[PDB]
Structures are given as structure tokens and as C-alpha cells.
Amino acid sequence: VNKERTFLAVKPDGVARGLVGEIIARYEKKGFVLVGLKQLVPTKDLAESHYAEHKERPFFGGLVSFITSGPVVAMVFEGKGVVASARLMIGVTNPLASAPGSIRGDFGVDVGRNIIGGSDSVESANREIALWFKPEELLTEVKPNPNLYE
Amino acid sequence: VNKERTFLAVKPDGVARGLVGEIIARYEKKGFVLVGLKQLVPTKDLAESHYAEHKERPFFGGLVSFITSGPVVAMVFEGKGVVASARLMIGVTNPLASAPGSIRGDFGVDVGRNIIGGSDSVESANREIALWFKPEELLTEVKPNPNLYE
Amino acid sequence: VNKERTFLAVKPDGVARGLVGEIIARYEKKGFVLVGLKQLVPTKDLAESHYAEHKERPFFGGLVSFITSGPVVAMVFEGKGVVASARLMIGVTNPLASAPGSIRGDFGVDVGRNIIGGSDSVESANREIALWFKPEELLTEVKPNPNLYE
Amino acid sequence: VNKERTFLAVKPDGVARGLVGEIIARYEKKGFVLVGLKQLVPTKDLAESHYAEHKERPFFGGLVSFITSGPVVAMVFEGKGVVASARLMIGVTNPLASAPGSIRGDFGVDVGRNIIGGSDSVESANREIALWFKPEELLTEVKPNPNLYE
Amino acid sequence: VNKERTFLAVKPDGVARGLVGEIIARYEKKGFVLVGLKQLVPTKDLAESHYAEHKERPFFGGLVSFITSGPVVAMVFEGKGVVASARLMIGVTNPLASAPGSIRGDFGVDVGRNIIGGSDSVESANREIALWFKPEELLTEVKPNPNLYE
Amino acid sequence: VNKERTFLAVKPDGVARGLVGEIIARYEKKGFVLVGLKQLVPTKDLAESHYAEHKERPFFGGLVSFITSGPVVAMVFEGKGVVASARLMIGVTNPLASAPGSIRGDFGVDVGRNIIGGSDSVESANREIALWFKPEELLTEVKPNPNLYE
Ligand SMILES: Cc1cn([C@H]2C=C[C@@H](COP(=O)(O)OP(=O)(O)OP(=O)(O)O)O2)c(=O)[nH]c1=O
Ligand SMILES: Cc1cn([C@H]2C=C[C@@H](COP(=O)(O)OP(=O)(O)OP(=O)(O)O)O2)c(=O)[nH]c1=O
Ligand SMILES: Cc1cn([C@H]2C=C[C@@H](COP(=O)(O)OP(=O)(O)OP(=O)(O)O)O2)c(=O)[nH]c1=O
Ligand SMILES: Cc1cn([C@H]2C=C[C@@H](COP(=O)(O)OP(=O)(O)OP(=O)(O)O)O2)c(=O)[nH]c1=O
Ligand SMILES: Cc1cn([C@H]2C=C[C@@H](COP(=O)(O)OP(=O)(O)OP(=O)(O)O)O2)c(=O)[nH]c1=O
Ligand SMILES: Cc1cn([C@H]2C=C[C@@H](COP(=O)(O)OP(=O)(O)OP(=O)(O)O)O2)c(=O)[nH]c1=O
Ligand SMILES: [Mg+2]
Ligand SMILES: [Mg+2]
Ligand SMILES: [Mg+2]
Ligand SMILES: [Mg+2]
Ligand SMILES: [Mg+2]
Ligand SMILES: [Mg+2]
Incomplete structure (x- = not known):
């Protein structure tokens, strides 16, 4: 379905380096639609849950500390196969x-x-x-460019 | 000082056209720091307050209708002379x-x-x-870039 | 030979999405030479002979109607191994x-x-x-660029 | 009206330098619609009628020979105030x-x-x-984009 | 004459920010030809002579200290009116x-x-x-793209 | 370590084609630091030494002739895995x-x-x-970017 969604976070390094716009632009050019977007400084609680699957791994600690070290731009994109596609991207x-x-x-x-x-x-x-997002922060009315889908 | 801030909004047309990243990238490349960012569909109230100075202008009704017709990406950028510079841009x-x-x-x-x-x-x-932004949505920690500011 | 040619069409979706220039630019930058170019709305017969190899396939009908649904920018590019290279691109x-x-x-x-x-x-x-092209619509004179070819 | 049209030609130097796509992309991005497009090598008569206003000027001869010296990509773009806007561009x-x-x-x-x-x-x-274009080479159907026009 | 030259230096801030390539690219796209290029850390002697005209001005000191603070990419570009053009750029x-x-x-x-x-x-x-440059560091054989000049 | 370095050279064709900035920008954007940069026309000796491993290959003569036919922009980039990464790029x-x-x-x-x-x-x-580079032409001071390296 063309309504699949994925979560993407431009990490503190991506933000510090001035890559937010470049990254968002790549997903827009692809045809994906932004349904959620905000900048925030992640709390330890957030990071820990986000990266819950790595609580064990030795790199878990520094990761949590890194994502909470500065602003992050959290985003949600919608489109056909956006989860696999965004990873490929x-x-x-x-x-x-x-x-x-x-x-x-x-x-x-x-x-x-x-x-x-x-x-x-x-x-x-x-x-x-x-x-990362409250339901009211996510678009319900999604308008993909009419030239993207059959 | 270098703490001046301005409010910028990618209107529904800019968002529908996939210009969000391009616009954000322009301001990032310029050296201005993103201190607030979010996507939302404006309410009539927000829209009318935002454009209150134009409430008696003929284009006001269509403007309010349009600005509330879809998502807007609201942002706040910080830097020396950011307000006049953003306008020039x-x-x-x-x-x-x-x-x-x-x-x-x-x-x-x-x-x-x-x-x-x-x-x-x-x-x-x-x-x-x-x-457009609650205080808690705006960064407070903004270490000026030694590469951008003397 | 450095005079191999390939046929490329920016389909109705690529044209509607304003990707014609971006696409042409990628082939120009690669070093391929534009020897034919035009925008037209494909007829049913053209579409059908173009996709003749798929005339028995299920998606054929939807494909032909789509190709004929709006303007297409048809192009011919010349250069060493341009057919396979253009597909890789x-x-x-x-x-x-x-x-x-x-x-x-x-x-x-x-x-x-x-x-x-x-x-x-x-x-x-x-x-x-x-x-797609009458001989007169294709360049005959193409002196290879000494910077692109030995 | 939003249906104003203008004639643009990527001259032999622009074509030889591989700037065709870059140029088309700028007009597409601006929101203008390609209603005519083709590459051709201008005849002496075409060049001369095109630059008829300069037929008495000293550079006229060199201009006509240049325009006819190699391929040109002729285009027609449609949109509100496209003639003056295209010149500003x-x-x-x-x-x-x-x-x-x-x-x-x-x-x-x-x-x-x-x-x-x-x-x-x-x-x-x-x-x-x-x-430069026969009527049949120009789009007749151009529904204005609701994202570009009120 | 098409052999006019100008000196451009991407300052330590331009280099630190990763703008060398972007800047060189702008001048290449314009048609100008690189006739000298090198990265170095300017010596006080060099900076002082470079900015000799400002020895008086109160900002002279910090300027000298800034240009000598890190690597700089010194360049020489050739082309018609390159001095005025590069400043406009x-x-x-x-x-x-x-x-x-x-x-x-x-x-x-x-x-x-x-x-x-x-x-x-x-x-x-x-x-x-x-x-900034020894004569043997500057090209004597300059090859502008044959499509740039009459 | 993050001090690995590689040698890259924009060959005469890349230089003639105005690709120097584009190439340098790619490596800058990647996070590699430019530790050496210069433009020069290679000598037969330099060229033959650079490509010494291919001295018995059939293409060697034409390669040496070409590499010495015009300016080359030589550079050295530093960073973790830069050699293999540069090749991938x-x-x-x-x-x-x-x-x-x-x-x-x-x-x-x-x-x-x-x-x-x-x-x-x-x-x-x-x-x-x-x-290609004397020790004095290579930076010695390279503070790793905290944004690029953990
Ligand atoms: C595996 C790994 C990872 N990391 C950092 C990078 C991304 C995150 C999460 O790792 P991951 O989940 O295995 O990788 P990946 O899916 O590519 O990254 P995320 O998209 O989840 O951030 O931690 C790290 O610092 N060291 C490591 O060894
Ligand atoms: C003057 C005018 C304007 N508009 C739209 C464009 C911007 C907004 C607000 O107008 P404005 O405040 O005068 O323009 P400007 O500062 O350039 O734009 P904003 O940055 O405030 O949106 O209304 C419109 O639809 N019709 C009109 O006649
Ligand atoms: C296989 C297939 C294809 N198509 C569309 C996509 C490209 C064209 C032609 O298909 P194709 O000939 O197999 O693929 P390909 O060479 O990649 O496409 P073209 O470059 O020829 O358009 O039809 C479709 O709509 N449904 C399908 O199931
Ligand atoms: C005035 C002039 C012009 N030219 C070239 C440049 C554009 C064309 C047409 O000149 P023009 O008509 O006055 O300028 P302009 O509108 O900017 O150019 P075109 O867009 O019409 O090519 O001739 C030239 O070679 N020498 C000259 O002295
Ligand atoms: C005038 C001025 C300048 N500067 C810095 C910026 C460029 C250099 C040289 O100044 P300039 O010579 O007047 O400006 P400009 O030509 O634009 O810059 P350069 O191309 O010469 O670096 O010093 C500064 O720090 N403060 C100042 O008030
Ligand atoms: C194999 C080959 C190569 N060449 C040119 C291209 C790169 C150089 C050196 O060849 P190489 O060393 O095998 O390729 P490669 O590592 O990819 O390129 P360089 O980065 O060394 O230039 O010679 C050529 O002209 N003809 C050939 O047949
Ligand atoms: Mg992961
Ligand atoms: Mg206003
Ligand atoms: Mg096919
Ligand atoms: Mg004119
Ligand atoms: Mg100056
Ligand atoms: Mg090799």
C-alpha cells in the first residue's frame, strides 16, 4: 500500500553538519510525503526506547548519549515501500x-x-x-503527487 | 547580536511541491541555525493571527483558506541579521x-x-x-559556529 | 563504436513532475550527445509499436494508455556503449x-x-x-569530443 | 493570463557545452510548462527571420552564422508572465x-x-x-497546476 | 582580452566549512580556466603583503591572524573580465x-x-x-572550452 | 586510523571538462580532509613513475602521453579508510x-x-x-571533526 510509513531521524551529527535540508530533499525528490516533522533534543528515555534492541550491545551507552547530545530532526515519511526504500537511500x-x-x-x-x-x-x-510522535502530530490527509502512483 | 531569530514557513504549495528540503538547505548553507522546526496544518485562528496585519486586505480570505488547506513546515532560524537576510533569500x-x-x-x-x-x-x-512555537520547542543551546562568526 | 545510439523517453509522469531537464542533464554530464529531441503526445499506434514486445502481457493495456496520457519527451543519445550505460543510469x-x-x-x-x-x-x-524520429530529426554530424574519447 | 508563452533557444554554444538539461530544469523548477521542444540545426532563413530586428546591425552576420553553426534546442514555455520572467532568468x-x-x-x-x-x-x-514551431508541435492542453496557480 | 587573470583565495573559514569544491565549481561553470591552484597555510609575511592596503585599518591585525590561522586554497582564474566577474560572483x-x-x-x-x-x-x-604564485606554478598553455569565446 | 591518506588526481580530461570543483566537493562532503592540493602539468618522468606498475601494459604510452598533455589537479585526502572509500567514490x-x-x-x-x-x-x-607532493605541501595539523568521528 502507498500508505506505508517509516521513521527517520537526522542525528545530532547530521544536524550539526547542516544536512537536514539535503536529506529531506532526497526523500521529497523520491516522491515520499512528509507526514511528521520536528526538531527536538531527545531525552535519555526516548533514545533508550528508540534503540531498545541494542540495550545489550556494548555500543548502546555511547549511542544513547550521542543521540541526546544535541538537536535531532525526527521525521515520518509515507509512500509505497518507504521503509525498505529509505534504508536503501x-x-x-x-x-x-x-x-x-x-x-x-x-x-x-x-x-x-x-x-x-x-x-x-x-x-x-x-x-x-x-x-517519537503524538498522533495529532502526524498528517491524516496525505497528498502524494498524482504522477507518482498508478 | 548573532542571536536574532526569524520565523519562516514553507506554505502548502511549497510543501506539496517537495521544496521543503531545498529551502531548509538554503538556510543551513547560509550559516543560520535551525532553532525550531515542525510540520502542521494551520488552524483558521493561527492563520488569521499570523496574517492579522492583512485582515482588511482583499486577498486575506483566500490567503487564510489556502494557508489552512494543507501542511505547512514552520521553522525558526537564528543568526546575525537573519530576519532581513531571510527576506533577501x-x-x-x-x-x-x-x-x-x-x-x-x-x-x-x-x-x-x-x-x-x-x-x-x-x-x-x-x-x-x-x-507558532512554544518555548519548549525552541533550542536554547546555540554555540555559535567559529567558522561563521568572528 | 563511439556512435552507438539509444532511444530514451521521459514518460508522462517524468514530464508532469518536471524532471525533463534533470534527466537530460544527467546524460549530457555523462558525455553522451543529444542527436534527437522532441516533445509529443504519443499516439496509440506509436505506443503499441514501441512496447510491441509486451503486447501479450497483462500490463500492456495500462502501459499504452499511460504513455499516451500526456506529453513525452523523446530523445536519442549517442556514444560508446550508450544503450547499456543509459539503462544502468x-x-x-x-x-x-x-x-x-x-x-x-x-x-x-x-x-x-x-x-x-x-x-x-x-x-x-x-x-x-x-x-520515434524521422532521419531529418537526427543529427548526422557528431565529431567526438576529444575530452570524452581517446 | 496564465497561458502566456515565450520562445527560448539553447544556442549552439549552450548545446555544445551540455547545458540543455540545466536550462530546461530551471524553467521546469520555476513552474513554467514545456509546450514545445525540439533540437534542430537552424537554416540561414530561420536565423535571419528570428533576428530580423537586427538585420541592419553590424553583429547580425556573425550572429546568424553562429546560430546556424550547430544544433539548437528550441523550446516554448507557458505560464503567467513567462516572457519577462524568462528574460530575468x-x-x-x-x-x-x-x-x-x-x-x-x-x-x-x-x-x-x-x-x-x-x-x-x-x-x-x-x-x-x-x-520555430508548427501548431501541431505545441501542446494545446495545459491544465494549470493548482500548486502553482491560485 | 580573454587572458585577464584574477587571484582568489578560499579563506580558512571557506576551507574549514568544506566549500572549496563548491567555489571552484562556480568559476568552472562560468567558463573560467584555473591557471594556478594550491593549498597552503599563509605566513604572516604573505598575509601582510596580500592585505597591505589595509595595514592602517583597525581590522588589519585580526585579518592577518585569521588568514594565517589555517589552510587556504589560493587560486588563479583566467578569462574575459574575470576580475570584475569573480567579484560579482x-x-x-x-x-x-x-x-x-x-x-x-x-x-x-x-x-x-x-x-x-x-x-x-x-x-x-x-x-x-x-x-602567492611562482611563475612556474601558473599555466602558460591555456585551453578555454571553444564554445565560450567568439 | 583516521589519519590514512590517499592520492587523487583530476586528469587532463577532468580538468578540461570543468569537473575539478565537483570532484573536490564530493570528497569534502564525505568528510575527508584536503591535506594537499596543486595544479600542474605532469612531466614524462612523473607520469611514468606514477604509472610505473603499468609500464609493460599496451596502454602505457598513450596514458603517459595523455596525462602529460595538460594540467592535472593533484590532491591528497585524509580520513578513516580514505583509500578504499575514494576508490568506491x-x-x-x-x-x-x-x-x-x-x-x-x-x-x-x-x-x-x-x-x-x-x-x-x-x-x-x-x-x-x-x-607528487613534497612534505612541506602537506598539512600536518588536522584536528578531526567531532561531527565526523566518534
Ligand atoms: C552496529 C553499530 C551501530 N552504531 C550506531 C550507528 C547507528 C546506531 C544503530 O545501529 P544499527 O541499528 O545496528 O544500525 P542502523 O540500523 O544502520 O542504524 P540506525 O538507522 O538504526 O541508527 O548505532 C555504533 O555506533 N556502533 C556499532 O557498532
Ligand atoms: C499582496 C498579496 C499577497 N498575497 C499572499 C502572499 C504573501 C501573503 C502575505 O502578504 P505580504 O505579507 O504582503 O507578503 P510577504 O511578506 O512577501 O509574504 P509572507 O512572507 O508574509 O507570506 O499573502 C496574496 O495572495 N495576494 C496579494 O495580493
Ligand atoms: C513489467 C511491467 C512494466 N510496466 C511498465 C514499466 C516499464 C514499461 C516497460 O516494461 P519493461 O520493458 O519490462 O521494463 P523496462 O525496460 O525497465 O521499461 P521501459 O524502459 O521499456 O519503459 O512498462 C508496468 O507498468 N508493469 C509491469 O508489470
Ligand atoms: C548586441 C549584440 C548581440 N549579440 C548576440 C547576443 C544575443 C543576440 C541577439 O541580440 P539582442 O537581441 O540585442 O540581445 P538579447 O535579447 O539579450 O539576445 P537573444 O536572447 O535575443 O539572443 O546577438 C552579439 O553577438 N553582439 C552584439 O553586439
Ligand atoms: C572591511 C572589512 C573587511 N574585513 C575582512 C573581510 C575581507 C577582508 C578584506 O576587506 P576588503 O578588502 O575591504 O573587502 P573585500 O574586497 O570584499 O575582501 P577580500 O576579497 O579582499 O578578502 O577583511 C573585516 O574583517 N572587517 C571589515 O570591516
Ligand atoms: C586498463 C586501462 C587503463 N587505462 C587508463 C585508465 C586508468 C589508468 C591506469 O589504469 P589502472 O590503474 O588499471 O586503472 P585505475 O586504477 O582504475 O585508474 P587510476 O586511478 O590508477 O588512473 O590507465 C587506459 O587508458 N587503458 C586501459 O586499457
Ligand atoms: Mg537500526
Ligand atoms: Mg508578510
Ligand atoms: Mg523495456
Ligand atoms: Mg533579443
Ligand atoms: Mg579586497
Ligand atoms: Mg590505478
């Missing part, structure tokens, strides 16, 4: 291994400063969207 | 008269579909920021 | 599976609105070029 | 005096290789369009 | 007053962090070129 | 086989005119940097 975890053309491939070098984060499955997307 | 009210290089100049043709709106003075900016 | 049939960096990968989300079409072999290209 | 006769942001300002350095030509009045445009 | 001293489309207008906010510096006259250009 | 030897998004993929069509050259290993990089 982001690249892979390691920016050095990300293909040119992808966001990490074009802009990053370090795993811990990998610019943006995106939901890895519809299940996770739904969970993270609910986490 | 936007162009003039009529996009056809706006210079190539300005946002309306590069992207618009109709006064009623002029893509973005920005505060016209520090006074208007203070009033507009207050209308 | 386009992506794969499904824009969602097309890599960031490719035309469909950067701009599309639906197989039926996949922006551009390109010949898939030298044979198909010669055939398609003959279908 | 082009710059002024001398690219060196053309403002950054304009086509000549960004890409040229010589009056005789000034990249693109555009009609300078509605009268001239209608005349020029009739010179 | 740079903007005015104050980035806030520089027009969008110009380098300072697009990227800066502070007079002391104004990204790039360019010769203000052929006389000064010649002096600065001689100052 | 360049593409593969044959531009036609290089992926959209890579430099050769976006801009080239001929193996002999493949725009840029980059070290293929840390060993080759150390050798190449030493060939």
Missing part, C-alpha cells in the same frame, strides 16, 4: 561501505557518526513513529 | 519579480502561491515565533 | 529496487510511474529510434 | 554583467556566446513561436 | 548584504568570516598573483 | 561499468578518459603522495 551501517548516491555513502566515514537513522522494518517503523 | 512578494537565486525567484510564478513566508522585521519575527 | 524496472544515484532510484516509487524508458539492446534502440 | 545581453543566479550570469563570459536566447515581449514571442 | 564585503546566488550571499553571515577573497582590480590581481 | 576503471553516483559513473564513457585517478591501496597511496 541511507546506505548500510558503516558509511565507508555505503554506496555513493546513498546518504551515508555520500556524507559519512564513521559508524558512530552516521548521520541518519531509519526504521529497519514496518514493525519497527510503527513502534518508533508511535514513540 | 526569499525574494519579494511577487515571485515573478523575485531575482534568480532567491527562493520565490527560482520556484514561483503566482503571488498567492509564493512558496514560503518569512518575518519582515524583528518585531514581526518575535510575534510570529511566539504564535 | 536509469536503474531497474521497479524504481523502489533502483539504486540511489540512478534516475528511477532517485525519483520514483512505482513500476507503472517509473519516469523514463530506455532501449534495452542496440537492436531495440535502432528500431525504437526509427519509430 | 536569462540575465542581460552580456553574460559578464548578468547576475549570479541567472543563466548567463552562471555560465557565460561572452556576448557572442551567451548560451540562450529568449523572446523579449509577448509580441516577439508569438512571432518567434510561429517561426 | 563573490558578492559584497558584507555577506548579509550579498545577493542570493553570490558566494557570500549563499554561504556567509559575518564580514570577518566571508569565505573567499578576490582581486578588486587587474592591477591588484597582477600584484597578488605574483605574491 | 571514483567507480571502476571503465566508466561505462561504473555505477551512477560514482565520479566515473556520472561523468565518463572512455577508459582512456576516465576523469580521475586514485590510489588503489595504502602502499600505493604512500608512494603516490610522495611522488
